[PDB]
Design a protein around this ligand. Sequence first.
Ligand SMILES: [Zn+2]
Lengths: 204, 126, 370, 45, 242, 121, 286
Amino acid sequence: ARIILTMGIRSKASETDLSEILPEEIEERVKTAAEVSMGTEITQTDLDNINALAEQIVEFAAYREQLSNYLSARMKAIAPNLTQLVGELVGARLIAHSGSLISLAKSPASTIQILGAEKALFRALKTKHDTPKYGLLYHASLVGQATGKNKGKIARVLAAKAAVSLRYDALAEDRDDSGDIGLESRAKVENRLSQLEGRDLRTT
Amino acid sequence: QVLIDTNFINFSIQKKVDIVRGMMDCLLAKCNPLITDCVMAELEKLGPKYRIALKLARDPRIKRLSCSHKGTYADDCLVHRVLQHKCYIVATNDAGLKQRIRKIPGIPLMSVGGHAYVIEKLPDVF
Amino acid sequence: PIEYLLFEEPTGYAVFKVKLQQDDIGSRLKEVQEQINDFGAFTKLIELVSFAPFKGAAEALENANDISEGLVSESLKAILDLNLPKASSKKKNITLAISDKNLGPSIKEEFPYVDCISNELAQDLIRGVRLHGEKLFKGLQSGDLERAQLGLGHAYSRAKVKFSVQKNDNHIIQAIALLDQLDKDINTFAMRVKEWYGWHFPELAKLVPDNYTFAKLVLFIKDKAXXXXXXXXXXXXXXXXXXXXXXXXXXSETDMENVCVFAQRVASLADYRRQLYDYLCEKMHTVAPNLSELIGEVIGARLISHAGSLTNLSKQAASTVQILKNKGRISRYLANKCSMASRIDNYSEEPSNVFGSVLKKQVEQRLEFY
Amino acid sequence: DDNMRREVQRDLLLIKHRAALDPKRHYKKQRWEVPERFAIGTIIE
Amino acid sequence: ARGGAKVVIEPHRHAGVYIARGKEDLLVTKNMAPGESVYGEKRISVEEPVPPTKVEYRVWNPFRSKLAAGIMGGLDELFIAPGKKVLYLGAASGTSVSHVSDVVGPEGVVYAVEFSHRPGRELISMAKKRPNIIPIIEDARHPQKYRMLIGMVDCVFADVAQPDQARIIALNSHMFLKDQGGVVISIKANCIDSTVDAETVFAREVQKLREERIKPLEQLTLEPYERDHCIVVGRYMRSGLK
Amino acid sequence: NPKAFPLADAALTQQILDVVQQAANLRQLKKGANEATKTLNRGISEFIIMAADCEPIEILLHLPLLCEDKNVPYVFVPSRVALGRACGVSRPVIAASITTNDASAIKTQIYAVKDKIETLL
Amino acid sequence: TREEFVSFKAHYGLVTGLCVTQPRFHDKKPDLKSQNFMLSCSDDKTVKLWSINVDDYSNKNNEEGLIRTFDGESAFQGIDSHRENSTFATGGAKIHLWDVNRLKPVSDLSWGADNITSLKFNQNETDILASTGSDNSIVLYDLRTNSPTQKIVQTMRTNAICWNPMEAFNFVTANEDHNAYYYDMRNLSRSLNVFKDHVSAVMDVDFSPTGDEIVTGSYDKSIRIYKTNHGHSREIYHTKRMQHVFQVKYSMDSKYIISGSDDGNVRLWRSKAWERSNVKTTREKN
RNA sequence: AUCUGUUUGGUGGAACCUGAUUAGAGGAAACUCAAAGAGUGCUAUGGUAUGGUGACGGAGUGCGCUGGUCAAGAGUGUAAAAGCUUU
RNA sequence: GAGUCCCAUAACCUUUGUACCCAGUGAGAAA
RNA sequence: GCGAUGAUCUACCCAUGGGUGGGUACAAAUGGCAGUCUGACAAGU
Ligand SMILES: [Zn+2]
């Protein structure tokens, strides 16, 4: 959409710079496709409401960056000891699945792993099978930093320490509000992670 | 559209009938007789003492149609033009070719006997 | 004696030199015909001499529409000034090998000493040039044929079909698919707006039912409160400022400015909708005006979307096309005429508005009959 | 894959023996071994 | 045969063609441009794994397309393929050429050729969702006019009903067709000769093809679908026709 | 260049409309553009008679787009009124169609007209 | 293409010889490029010009056949044209030279009052004509003296001759004893070679435009090729489907041998059995 | 159910038979090693290779080639002229 | 030790609120 | 002052008004199915 406000017609295409939008290889590439392309010409009445979708696309994405900014304010409002650990988006969704913050901290640690993956869980218990091991916690920034089966072993240590961080956030009437427990929680997982990546199954 | 052997030409000469004018007597309708390219390659290969048949074979009312073969042998050029279409009407007097076509369904075979020609598997004889 | 040849491309022309002529009695053979798939053998025939590329894609269309006439363009005239050595007009001409019999006289009209040959001899060489393709050109062709065929294929087609983009009807399709999602969302975010704005003023949404104006007063009055100018923009103005005094819901500040930008998003988006609506009301007035006279721009544009084009209203039987005692009578009696209006929109070049009004008054008197 | 097998395995076993599903159909005589690659899907209208 | 029932897709013996083995069977080729059926035929969807992407499959109506019955009657080698270029003749609309585009895939191209403007106008608007179809609106009897626009195609397809059908393929097989790449004629008995019989025209148009150095491999009749046609898969030898 | 192409000759107008009249009595004639549209979808039409003098010429002009898609021949006749009396209908029929029916006494006569239509194409 | 341009029911009798030359009319010029011209020589006292529509050059876009007929007194035996200025003599009971523009012949030539059966002009020193005889003879003619020039009498009659194009003063002849002979025009006391290879009468010889080879066809059902040097056939051509070859002509690019037959087909061959129509790469060529 | 016992799927697989195979059959790995096909890609270019052994090349010069235009002459042609062919 | 996304960022069923309903045929209706 | 440029045709009771029967679609539900994994060893020398 940002191209349409810059590119316009195919002869406006070759002349106008795309340094700001997709540069240095694709700018040459859209210049190449500009001269030979199977599409038609478009009138200046038809370049009015593609010329006003290019506004309304951009104003959505410019609103969404204000919108994820709004949760990052609300993470550090409600549970900042949580969102120093797992990030704004997971903690937006772990609260969203349970409901209130108080309802989430009353759950134990091991049910904060599998808070998302409830469809594959109760299938795997009602028929005798294997429980899913990540859950909604899998899209944390830290499970992705691990590899292999170590995505499982960090998914315990997070859901333990996130359960430690949540109860300091739901159930402390005084909050230091700096993520002071949470950054002590994340440094324990990074010690757990870099221990667990140093160990390897191979033979030396 | 009637295919023609070497043998049907040879016994046409001994029995004193025209091809085109004499076929219409047996057949009672109009016909376009057409010698293939393999069959003309036999009539030349028969040699000097069959050359009066080779004159009568090249007649502009006798049509010619080519074929895509690697061979002269027209006894098996002919059946292969018959299975794949079944519009033709074979004119032979070879004994082995008659047995090769009487097993094929629905192909009017035509031979020469006595005075005029005879047809076999036409349902519309008269 | 086929000395030079000429192969045409979307990337300009080419003038080749025949180094060796293939032997011409023996041209149906397996040997000389299987040489021309083999680039080692075909090179001994052909050397490139010239390659003048087209100056632009628009000049290509003018030149590609000139070969199919049979005539000689500017550049095709201009290339042959270089490459062909000037020979006599009567004795010992110069031979050029042309792909077309029809192009033949138009060269000799311009260049009287050039004899144009299109035998099955000469056309065998030109067909050889297509097969080995870009390897003959030794990289002088900047870009490729494979992109150049595609655009020049569509542009040659669009010229001879001759449809303007203003005649196109996918603009009716995409706009209907866009107006319905605007209507899907404008109430949706405004219902979100009230469920944000219920924490501050539950009374104003009762006064203001329109989603377009309810998102403006949130932009206008962020807090309580009299002496409000745009609240008169008058009966609801005093009914709101007094209701602003009688407030029940609670009161933060950045959180409401979230709702301010969120209620900003509604009023800008419905402004786009009223902008998009007039475009569709105009393109209906452009593309299918005889259909626009009967039912109007909106319901006319709905039918083209459910047909998937404007063509599939013309192809369908009038009983089959469907719009919604009057059901049994008028919904059939209009759908006959609704079919007929959509025929004469499709197959005219510039459709007339006048016959739709003529077709409209026929439908009126059956409504008078009811 | 070896997941989602049961609603697939019942389906393919109901196609290898599809001659019995209705006594008026009588399909051609074929064997229909289970192919290596397939993609069960529905019909959009 | 409803919108509810779920169908197994399975790859056909020919590449690029797919069989929909349901309670009844269907012939199906993968839609290159999803979400739209070009003439209203009922289309199948699946999903393939990020959430799984949507791949849509379009049914291949036999009674609409003369090519379509020959698959479903059974041809040994159909020279159309998911990589090959293919030349098409007489594509009035996207009744069949949109199908032939989907079976050659996003790599290979298809050259739609038809003379008339109003069906050709529809062929334009379909060709701007399928990038393979580049449509040519010149007459098929004069191939020197569109010689700039097509280069070295791998199999022509012939859906012309003009009675000079052998000469209109020879001028497109000699000048555009890559050697040793097949030719799929579709002969209609009534439109060539209405005086002589159905079977004579089949024995006449094969022998006209063998004059133009096309050895025809096989011949199908496609009788239960369409009345009295043939499609004759050729091969353009040009060199060693024997 | 004209939009009502191909328009038939005066001698061919007679031979078409006379075949229309017997097909009217044998019930193979289907009468009306909205009814002739359907037989193109069912695939059972033999050929299409169209009236050139109906106003407009474009209300029925969808049929050659629909016929040449399916290789069904078609003509133009000059009068919708004279197609009316050939049709046996009190009102001028501006578009007619001949259905394929194999028990046709006029089967040898239809194919004489149909062969003289493909001559125009 | 190996097809006909046009077929002409020319004569009610036999044709006896064809020759080809584009005329040079005093009134106009018939086109070299758009048409080609055949001339025939009949039994029934008849010589007929023929136009041909030719599809070679695409420079253009009437007169498809039979421009004008030349009637005579005696039955015509053979023809050849003279490449300078629209000139051809006929073979008959009297060889008599023709102008294309004149219906009656210009000059009657005869060494003696005997029938004459075949002719050919030479390629260079163009005015020299060679004339056979059924009275087992050969009489050479010279046009610029308007006179016959000398005579040689062989043991059996000569069916056809041919001048070499390259040396232009030696002519090979085809003799009815199963042998062919090769002369010098200067000294007809000694033949330059004989070619003893056949078993029956040779009906036609043709000198290669290379000037090395001579190709001959006999009343035996076979065709020999020999060089000028070796005096014997290096190569014999035969198939079952040809009988009694009456006419044989070497190609003009000197590679493919044409061969007329009594069986009615025109069979064409190669000169060397190995030379191909392929154009060969630098590795294969060496 | 200490009711019976067929059907379907899974395991197992004897006797006879019929087919094929054999220094018993089979699996796993790869920047290994070695035979041998089939297809594709690559400018894959001396039709007789360079302008030149001071016996050389450059420059001018003369001849020769090539083109169209002008002019005479020849030929056809007509009563003549027009037109007309022209190594 | 331990199957997420194939969507519990859902699907289905039920209950209420809202809106609505019981393609073809082809030559007669009006007196 | 008609029509192929289309005439015609496709649950209940209550005296031109309504209720009851079902179906389609939308939206809502802190309605339902629907219950929130294991618990002490592991890794290094
Ligand atoms: Zn054969």
